[PDB]
Ligand binder design. Sequence first.
Ligand code: AKG
Ligand code: FE
Lengths: 19, 218
Amino acid sequence: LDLETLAPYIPMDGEDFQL
Amino acid sequence: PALKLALEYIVPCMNKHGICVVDDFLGKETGQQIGDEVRALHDTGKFTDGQLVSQKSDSSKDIRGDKITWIEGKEPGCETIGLLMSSMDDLIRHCNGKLGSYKINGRTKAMVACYPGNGTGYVRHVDNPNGDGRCVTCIYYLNKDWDAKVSGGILRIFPEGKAQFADIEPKFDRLLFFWSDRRNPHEVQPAYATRYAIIVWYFDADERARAKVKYLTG
Ligand SMILES: O=C(O)CCC(=O)C(=O)O
Ligand SMILES: [Fe+3]
């Protein structure tokens, strides 16, 4: 099975927090 | 104290087991403030159906039964969630270069998540199965008075190569770390009372850059 069909979504676009 | 907690407990725990529980992370007062903020988000209609990385013919509610919202930490009324997030970040920064071979430079916003009782849960899954950059999952639970033997909601992790699985009750003021990749398939067993958590995923710089490249080129 494509496990990405079960994985919790995160934004890929827009932008991430930098530590 | 972040330095000692990170270097003498979290790092060895993660490298040996891929899972690390820190109980009584922030104390009752801060945990309760965070709970009030989360319940305010809930009560004002902020939560929406949890989504999946790849959506296909099936309903998302067949997969995860929670409702969520994304929090940066600076929003009015989310100041204590912001303190939680900053404390998470402080621990991670103190583990720099010591969690596997990862180089953690960033993270998602915080996912504030609610399973609204009624037997909702999350089917067996891997948080990051195909390399989207997430290497560490960090979860803070804020369920005061939770009795998992009655209300369920247990997080069950199947850590790879272990003779036992790991059952994590969603205990008030509990912090949890685990590898996000296929080493830790897990499930949220059905919840029969309102269950709250706050989740952040920390990124490995190189893997996240490759994932973004794949996304931006189609
Ligand atoms: O709330 C939890 O214990 C885990 C949630 C989870 O597995 C997810 O959102 O990917
Ligand atoms: Fe998960």
